[PDB]
Symmetry: none
Subunit: 54 residues, 10 copies
Amino acid sequence: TKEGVVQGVATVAEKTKEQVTNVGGAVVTGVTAVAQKTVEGAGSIAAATGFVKK
Amino acid sequence: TKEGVVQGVATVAEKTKEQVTNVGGAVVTGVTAVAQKTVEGAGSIAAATGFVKK
Amino acid sequence: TKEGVVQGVATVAEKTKEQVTNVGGAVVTGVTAVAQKTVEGAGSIAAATGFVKK
Amino acid sequence: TKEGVVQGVATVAEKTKEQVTNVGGAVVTGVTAVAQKTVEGAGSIAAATGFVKK
Amino acid sequence: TKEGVVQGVATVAEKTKEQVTNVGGAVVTGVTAVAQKTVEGAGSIAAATGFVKK
Amino acid sequence: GVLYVGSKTKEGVVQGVATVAEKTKEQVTNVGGAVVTGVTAVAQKTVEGAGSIAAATGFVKKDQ
Amino acid sequence: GVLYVGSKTKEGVVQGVATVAEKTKEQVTNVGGAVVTGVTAVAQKTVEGAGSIAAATGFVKKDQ
Amino acid sequence: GVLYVGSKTKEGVVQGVATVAEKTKEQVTNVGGAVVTGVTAVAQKTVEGAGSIAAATGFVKKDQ
Amino acid sequence: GVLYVGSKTKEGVVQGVATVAEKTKEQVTNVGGAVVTGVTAVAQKTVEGAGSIAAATGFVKKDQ
Amino acid sequence: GVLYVGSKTKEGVVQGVATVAEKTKEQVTNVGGAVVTGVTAVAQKTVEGAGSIAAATGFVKKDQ
């Protein structure tokens, strides 16, 4: 009995010479796990990864 | 009995010399897992990856 | 019986020479796990990773 | 019986020569685990990692 | 019976020559675990890691 | 008999060798063998001898 | 008989070797063998002898 | 008989060797073998002898 | 018989060796073997002898 | 018989060796073997002898 769940995330990453340049923005290069059961509300935002709001 | 669930994410990545340049935006090059059961609401946003809102 | 849960996140990362330059923004290159059962509210924001709000 | 829980986060990272330069922003390159059961409120923000609000 | 709990965080990190330069901002490169059951309030902020508010 | 009068002679010489090598993730797995990845200069006037071997790079011999 | 009168001779010489090597993650796994990744200069006037070996780099011999 | 009158001779010489090596995470695993990653200069006038070996770098011999 | 009259001779010489090595996380694991990572200069006029070995770097011999 | 009249001779010499090594986390694990990471200069006029060995760096012999 499982609801709103991330069970298993397995990542093997062997990068080499990685570089990231970001001006006034949002950059993600990793591992992100978000588990949420219930979110409610007007104009509401849930589970935003790399999100730019102007 | 499983609802709103990400069970297994397996990634093997052997990058080499990766570079990312982003100005005022959103860039994702990783692993993102989002599990949500119930989201409700007007103008609501759920599970946005690489999302630019102006 | 599991709800609103991240069970197992396993990451092996062997980077070498990684550099990150960010001006006035948000950058994430790691491992982020967020588990939330219930979030409620107008204009509310829950589980934002790499989020720029102007 | 588990709700609002992060069970197991396992990370092996063997970086070498990593450098991070950030001016007036937010940068995260580590391991962040946030578990919350219930958060409620207008204009409320919960679980923000790498979040810039202007 | 577990609610609002981070059980086990295990990290092995073998960095070498890491340097971080930050001007007027927020930078985190470590291990952060936050567990909260109930947070309530308008304009309230809970579990912010790398958060810049202007 | 060798007579040099007012002469200039270069005999058995490597004069100028210039090499630039840029790599990233160079990896070598070798079992019971010979792998050469370097820079090698060998200069010899006289090598004399039956069955002799001079200037071998990356050389495997299992003579039986 | 060797007679040099007012001569200039370079015999068995390596003059100038210049190398630049830039790597990142160089790794070598070697079992019962020979791996050479360096810079090697060998200069010899005279090597004399039956079955002799001069200037071997990365050399495996299992003569039986 | 060797006669040098007013001569300049370079015999068996390595003159100038210049090397720049920039690495990051160089790792070597070697079992029962020979691995050379360095800089080596060998200069010899005369090597004489049956079955002799002169100037070996990264050399494995299991002669039987 | 060797006669040098007013001569300049360089015999068996390594003149100038310049090396710059920049590393970070250099690690070496070696079992029953020979690993050389350094800088080596060997200069010899005369080496004489049957079965002789001169100027070996990273040398493994298990002669039987 | 050797006669030098008014001569200048360099025989068996290493003149100038300059090395700069910058490391961070250098670690070496060695079992029953030979690992050389240093700077070595060997200069010899004459080495004479059957089965002789001169100028060995990182040398393992288990002759049987």
